[PDB]
Amino acid sequence: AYSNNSIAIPTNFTISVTTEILPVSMTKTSVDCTMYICGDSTECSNLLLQYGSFCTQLNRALTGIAVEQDKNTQEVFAQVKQIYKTPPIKDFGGFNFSQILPDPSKPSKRSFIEDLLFNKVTDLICAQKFNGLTVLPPLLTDEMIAQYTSALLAGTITSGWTFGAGAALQIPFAMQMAYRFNGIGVTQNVLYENQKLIANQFNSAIGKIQDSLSSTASALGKLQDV
Amino acid sequence: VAVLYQGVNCTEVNVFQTRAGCLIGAEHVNNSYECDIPIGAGICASYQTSQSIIAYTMSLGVENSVAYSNNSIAIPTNFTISVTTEILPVSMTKTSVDCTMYICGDSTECSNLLL
Amino acid sequence: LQSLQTYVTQQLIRAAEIRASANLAATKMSECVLGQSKRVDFCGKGYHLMSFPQSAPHGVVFLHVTYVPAQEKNFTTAPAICHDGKAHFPREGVFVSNGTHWFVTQRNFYEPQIITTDNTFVSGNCDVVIGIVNNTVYDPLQPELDSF
Amino acid sequence: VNQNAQALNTLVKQLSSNFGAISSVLNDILSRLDPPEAEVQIDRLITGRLQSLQTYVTQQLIRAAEIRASANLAATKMSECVLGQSKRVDFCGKGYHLMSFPQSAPHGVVFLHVTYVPAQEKNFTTAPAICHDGKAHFPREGVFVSNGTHWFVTQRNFYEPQIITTDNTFVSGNCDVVIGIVNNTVYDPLQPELDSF
């Protein structure tokens, strides 16, 4: 409807959590020119050397892709050089973050959501190593990228936005939403009165994300094309 | 020089084994420092102490546990104005290559065959 | 050699593609995760609050907490209140009415508040403004000074 | 610059390779064999040198795509960081951005950014609200802090302690909803003025 004297203002709201899956790096590969022609023979080497520097250019090309490819994970995952830890005593004001936080009881450090991301994406490594194609491993293993992830979650949950502009400053997460509502022009009264309702909205939203990732495996197709 | 083999344990061959493969000629130190020349799978190397090449695990930086409480708050009483450097490229060297002089110069028969 | 040159050329073009996706992810890493972005549909649908990153093979998963309004009701508005003969413009929010008394509330949620001198400000007069309505702006110091 | 030099050097040095012929100089082959036996060897040079130039043109163009992604990022920082003030975090550099100084540099530009970072911190006691007459009071800008004696209102970015007043807060809601509210006395500046009157 369109009218000059008519206006619509929202009387209620909801907290929705969505998912965008963005790829960072690909698999590092280096292919030899001589072994791609043949090995254990001097006929491939004498006839291959007359074409010049093609081997050097294609080899430095695969090395350059692998170094810049390592640099993308370095420019994204680790923003800061300081590690943050999760406190043992958890009072968040009624919010349950245990799904996104790592579980120390597991042999490898991972969260409940990341446990599903590794299991829903597809040994093939030894199968490729049997035919002569060497897959170079990434410089950062899964435990250190997950430790970078646990550092940014533990820091945003406790210190928030402070460590980006300086030393990490401890703020209660209940007061963190007061400024996040104050930044978009919303009075903190919605937070302080509706905090009990927001606890059930957030905990149910995390349960819906866990159910969507477990039931639907096609949401990860952004990485599956890669 | 520290020779590294990729994707195989030590078979033929300070001989240690990593996830990337057999690494010979380097020493393994249990302590961890900041990496300089990277290898892969969280291990790097540097020339340190009668000095040689040492190999060690990636340090992810200083581990600090930030205190968290309901009534606790920290407000800064002082500030520091710092100036940093962001370096970015814009243009690259302009090159122009001619097909005739590059392929065959000073040749009329070859210049006619290229047309 | 020609088949391998085709392979490397295909790797550099996909390299520009994975770098463009990584640089966009780094931008959302700084704005959506670390800070608070007021940008619309950058950090995801709705008004952004916080973003939770998650490790994934050859990529990253962001969990975005946003504010999406749900229920609304149609109200009657007006740009200004004419009280003493000078126009009263809202300092923060918009003017709404249920049909009896005019209220002042923000655009993102409905919290009825009476018209006071601190919620508005005097600019111009009532004649140059199109659509101004008449009402009584409550002076909060009047009953305290009268009782004193 | 080193990568461009190494690319040009490889491009020239590839001319000396024979590419399946007797010799790399075209004048010695054209000066010995007749034209009909000669067309096979010149065609071998043509196919090889064409493939080397096609790799160079494709590789330089791939770097042109890198130069355009960097140019669009530089133009975005030139607009937001330099001309205006960007509120984006870690865009204009670490910290809260203030102003940018451009400097000419060979084949690029160097940015000197002035940022605002805190230095010394001190632990304080906070409360979400102040309960005075039975109605809650919330800070308009900033948070409630205390040194252990009196509750103060201060900004999050820097410490400038101020007395709790009616202009620094606003009356909304009551004291039984908000969790963590504490009791204290909210100073009203009208009271001593009326007592003196």
From Swiss-Prot, chain C:
The chain holds residues 1001 to 1148 of 1273 of the full protein. Glycans are attached at N74, N98, N134. Changing T27I: In strain: Gamma/P.1. It comes from the Viruses. Changing H101Y: In strain: Theta/P.3. Changing E92K: In strain: Theta/P.3. The gene is S. Disulfide bonds join C32-C43, C82-C126. Subunit of the fusion protein that is processed upon entry into the host cell. Mediates fusion of the virion and cellular membranes by functioning as a class I viral fusion protein. Contains a viral fusion peptide that is unmasked after S2 cleavage. This cleavage can occur at the cell membrane by host TMPRSS2 or during endocytosis by host CSTL. In either case, this triggers an extensive and irreversible conformational change that leads to fusion of the viral envelope with the cellular cytoplasmic membrane, releasing viral genomic RNA into the host cell cytoplasm. This is Spike protein S2'. The lineage of its organism: Viruses, Riboviria, Orthornavirae, Pisuviricota, Pisoniviricetes. It comes from Severe acute respiratory syndrome coronavirus 2 (2019-nCoV).
